[PDB]
Design a binder for this molecule. Structure first.
Ligand SMILES: N#Cc1ccc2c(Oc3ccccc3OCCn3ccc(=O)[nH]c3=O)cccc2c1
Ligand SMILES: [Mg+2]
Ligand SMILES: [Mg+2]
Lengths: 395, 541
């Protein structure tokens, strides 16, 4: 009912970001939604005296044929002064369910002085009419300050539920509310409905994957060459990996498909390498003061591999996505879904989103990514233009 | 007197840390002084300005050309920041289209009172024997940074109700002009136009009777009722060209390319690299002269675009012009274009047709979403199988929207495809190359499983070039199917990027060799790790 004073970081002006082109149906959906939001006083139209603009587009979440308004708050979030609680037990919980609490944010009024920075623009087709401009009178979804401000309120809402059973972990990131537990999915569903109506009144399944080497009865020259390449690669990550007895098999010059029988010393070397690989990595820690880097490799056939790390050859997490949902004919759709899942997991585990490095040209991604995007948050990303040799090594 | 509806002002604030303008007044001639005195007299009589006193410590210079030229340049730096033209091809055809234009656009809109004091200027009295006459603005000044935004916001605010009340008329506001199209009968159209005129008169916005029947000359375009085009393209004729005139020329050709199909700027654009001088004379190759010549050929026959019909599919068709050049036509019906265009490949070391095609499709898609607010169906010179293979085996994620194969050679194709697994019954070439970083001397060659060996000595070369060279040699001397083992991450990287064309002629020759091959398997191994068959001993000599 009262607006907590909010400013920006020292020496930083408000965000000015070009609104990118929108399709017709998205423009229409935004027009309808923003009209209805205007009627409810959530947002108000503004004049030219406001230089600031933040991008906006429209999406569709699954099970919903109704549009949702997605604001890209990245630059504004970066330009807000750091606002001054992470449950490491959330990742340990057997199951975690995600909720959208965004409807609750619109009750809290936004600081009047700060409202000028939340300005956005519904664009028009072919620049025939000037864009419709709005500013938020309440806490906007996607803004980093919104959960921080509603944090206390949310605590007040969750006091009875949390006090009632404290075997249930509750976390909050942006517009999303994550709830972990050990319960059964039926009882979990009933409990989540209980918390849902509890919200009325006022599905995930959570290690760094081991580097594996083939087990073969007979090795070709090619097999051993790939093995040596993978082991040499892994030697960066692991201290004691030695390829010298395996390389001694390749000695002479033979056809790639010719079978080379393993020697005693070579088999021993491979075994020792296996044992070394079975251990975890030496001295791997998570520095909260460092960036999270995510790298994704397209493996083909819907397969994707990823690694989250703060330092080269020290991996905080690794994973693989074969998941097939409506994505078969479309690479970019798959990539977007993968980025979303990796980001979600990153949010659960470390509390924050990773900086992505994407195996896609900038222009392609820039063109098509918003069409497949169902998340309320957005991460940062990079584009790698040089094909990695590590592709085969993470397969 | 009719009570003109008040236009609520726009609050204006100066930039934080900066103060109001203080600048000297120019030594103007007596005639100019008299002229400005008269102008400001009748202006004050109209109520667009008011006289102030010495209290105001803000002054901006003034001149005369009569016409009063007020210089706000030092005010524009002290004034806060305030918040793409419509493309003819996107305009939807209407039965009637009327152009209204407001006179005294900025002077019809009041200025924020608190800011008015900052707009002050002084008229020098003759022989400087009297204090100069002080004046301030009650309305939006000509040449003031805040004028266009405030004016268009006010205008929009006034236009909203008429628009909402009349859904059967379409209205587009640009700057000081209003363009009203409609599909209803001509009489009802004229009536509604007069209605709008009086509606604007309610806020005191004057619009002409009678006007300005088509064709409209607007922003370098000619707008006819059924069709649109560009105003005539004038290509300067000079015996010796200047870089500035090449900027002019390339700009003009670019402007003409949105409608005229087949425009090529590549040579002329290639001649502008690292110039940065307006007087510099540059030569022209036969390719360039022939390019500008055929460009003059294209500009002989005049061509028109049509307007946009939402009822029909939007179709983009692309053709390969060669040398990284692509041309596209966006149309509704066959032979009738909405518009046209071109895409030039980005500066790069290596590349292939498919990538450039993809980039073109992206460009056209963005352009389309801007203009028509939708993605067009594509007609592309690429077989479905070619695209299938390419995108499935590409290390990068890639996608093209809905499209069909049009067969109009040259067709985009995959020239070579590397094997997934080693080839049985195919000779295995272990290649290596190296160079001396001092003497710039090196060797490159191969040894195979059949005993075949070669080592070629090379001058003026680098390690990378010798690795590429070694691969090239393996390709030359091998049969239709070959397995090549290389220790080069560089060469493997390039070849895995799958270029069909390259800056490096060595890479081009390698590509040629690849094209001549039936099956090629390229395997990589760590160097210096003592892999047998991989001979550093020969090339490191
Ligand atoms: N000068 C000028 C000028 C005049 C009209 C503009 C405009 O005109 C329009 C304004 C509103 C609605 C449709 C419009 O044009 C649709 C296409 N079209 C265009 C011309 C014509 O005769 N008939 C026609 O069906 C739309 C955009 C810019 C315009 C600029
Ligand atoms: Mg080499
Ligand atoms: Mg070597």
């Amino acid at each position: 009912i009262e607006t907590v004073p909010v400013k920006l970081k020292p020496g930083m002006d408000g965000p000015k970001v070009k609104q990118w082109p929108l399709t017709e149906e998205k423009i229409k959906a935004l027009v309808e939604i923003c009209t209805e939001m205007e009627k409810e006083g959530k947002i108000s139209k503004i004049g030219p005296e406001n230089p600031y603009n933040t991008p906006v587009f429209a999406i569709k979440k699954k099970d919903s044929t109704k549009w949702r308004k997605l604001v890209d708050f990245r630059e504004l979030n970066k330009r807000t002064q750091d606002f001054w609680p992470h449950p490491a037990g959330l990742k340990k919980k057997k199951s975690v369910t995600v909720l959208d609490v965004g409807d609750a944010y619109f009750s809290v009024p936004l600081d009047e002085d700060f409202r000028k920075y939340t300005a956005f623009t519904i664009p028009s087709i072919n620049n025939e009419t000037p864009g419709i401009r709005y500013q938020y009178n309440v806490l906007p979804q996607g803004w980093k300050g919104s959960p921080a401000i509603f944090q206390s309120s949310m605590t007040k809402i969750l006091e009875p539920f949390k006090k009632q059973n404290p075997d249930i972990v509750i976390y909050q990131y942006m517009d999303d509310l994550y709830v972990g537990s050990d319960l059964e999915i039926g009882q979990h569903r009933t409990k989540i409905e209980e918390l849902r109506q509890h919200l009325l009144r006022w599905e995930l399944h959570p290690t760094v994957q081991p580097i594996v080497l083939p087990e073969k009865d007979s090795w070709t020259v090619n097999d051993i060459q790939k093995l040596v390449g993978k082991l040499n690669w892994a030697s960066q990550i692991y201290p004691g990996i030695k390829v010298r007895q395996l390389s001694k098999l390749l000695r002479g010059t033979k056809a790639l498909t010719e079978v080379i029988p393993l020697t005693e010393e070579a088999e021993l070397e491979l075994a020792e390498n296996r044992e070394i690989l079975k251990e975890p990595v030496h001295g791997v820690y998570y520095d909260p003061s460092k960036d999270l880097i995510a790298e994704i490799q397209k493996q083909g056939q819907g397969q994707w591999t990823y690694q989250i790390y703060q330092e080269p050859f020290k991996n905080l997490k690794t994973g693989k996505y074969a998941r097939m949902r409506g994505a078969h004919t479309n690479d970019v759709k798959q990539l977007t879904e993968a980025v979303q899942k990796i980001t979600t997991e990153s949010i659960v585990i470390w509390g924050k989103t990773p900086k992505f490095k994407l195996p896609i040209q900038k222009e392609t991604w820039e063109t098509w990514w918003t069409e497949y995007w169902q998340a309320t948050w957005i991460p940062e990303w990079e584009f790698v233009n040089t094909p990695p040799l590590v592709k085969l090594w993470y397969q | 007197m009719v009570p003109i509806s008040p236009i609520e002002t726009v609050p204006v604030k100066l930039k934080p840390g900066m103060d109001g303008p203080k600048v000297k007044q120019w030594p103007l001639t007596e005639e100019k002084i008299k002229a400005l005195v008269e102008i400001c007299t009748e202006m004050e009589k109209e109520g667009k300005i008011s006289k102030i006193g010495p209290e105001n410590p803000y002054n901006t210079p003034v001149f005369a050309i009569w016409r009063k030229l007020v210089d706000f340049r030092e005010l524009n730096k002290r004034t806060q920041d305030f918040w793409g033209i419509p493309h003819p091809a996107g305009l939807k055809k209407k039965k009637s289209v009327t152009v209204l234009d407001v006179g005294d656009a900025y002077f019809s809109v009041p200025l924020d009172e608190d800011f008015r004091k900052y707009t002050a200027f002084t008229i020098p009295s003759i022989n400087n024997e009297t204090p100069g006459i002080r004046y301030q603005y009650n309305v939006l000044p000509q040449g003031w940074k805040g004028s266009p935004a405030i004016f268009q916001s006010s205008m929009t605010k006034i236009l909203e109700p008429f628009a909402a009340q009349n859904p059967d008329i379409v209205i587009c506001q640009y700057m000081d002009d209003l363009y009203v199209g409609s599909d209803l009968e001509i009489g009802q159209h004229r009536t509604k136009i007069e209605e709008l005129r009086q509606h604007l008169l309610r806020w005191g916005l004057t619009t002409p009777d009678k006007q300005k029947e088509p064709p409209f000359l607007w922003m370098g375009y000619e707008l006819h009722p059924d069709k649109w085009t560009v105003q005539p393209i004038v290509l300067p004729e000079k015996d010796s060209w200047t870089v500035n005139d090449i900027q002019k020329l390339v700009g003009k050709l670019n402007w003409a390319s949105q409608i005229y199909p087949g425009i090529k700027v590549r040579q002329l654009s290639k001649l502008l690299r690292g110039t940065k001088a307006l007087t510099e004379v540059i030569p022209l190759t036969e390719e360039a002269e022939l390019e500008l010549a055929e460009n003059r050929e294209i500009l002989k026959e005049p061509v028109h675009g049509v307007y946009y019909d939402p009822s029909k599919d939007l179709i983009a068709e692309i053709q390969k012009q060669g040398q990284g050049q692509w041309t596209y036509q966006i149309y509704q019906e066959p032979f009738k274009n909405l518009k046209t265009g071109k895409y030039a490949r980005m500066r790069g070391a290596h590349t292939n047709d498919v990538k450039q095609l993809t980039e073109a499709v992206q460009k056209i898609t963005t352009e389309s979403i801007v203009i028509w607010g939708k993605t067009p169906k594509f007609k592309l010179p690429i077989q479905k199988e070619t695209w299938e293979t390419w995108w499935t085996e590409y290390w990068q994620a890639t996608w093209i929207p809905e499209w069909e194969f049009v067969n109009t050679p040259p067709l985009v194709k995959l020239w070579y495809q590397l094997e997934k697994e080693p080839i049985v019954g195919a000779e295995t070439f272990y290649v290596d190359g190296a160079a001396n970083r001092e003497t710039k001397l090196g060797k490159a060659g191969y040894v195979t499983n059949k005993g075949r060996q070669k080592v070629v000595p090379l001058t003026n070369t680098t390690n990378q070039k010798t690795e590429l060279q070694a691969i090239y040699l393996a390709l030359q001397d091998s049969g239709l199917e070959v397995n090549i083992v290389t220790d080069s991450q560089y060469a493997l990287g390039i070849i895995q990027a799958q270029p069909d064309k390259s800056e490096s002629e060595l890479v081009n020759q390698i590509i040629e060799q690849l094209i001549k091959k039936e099956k090629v398997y390229l395997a990589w191994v760590p160097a210096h790790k003592g892999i047998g068959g991989n001979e550093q001993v020969d090339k490191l000599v």
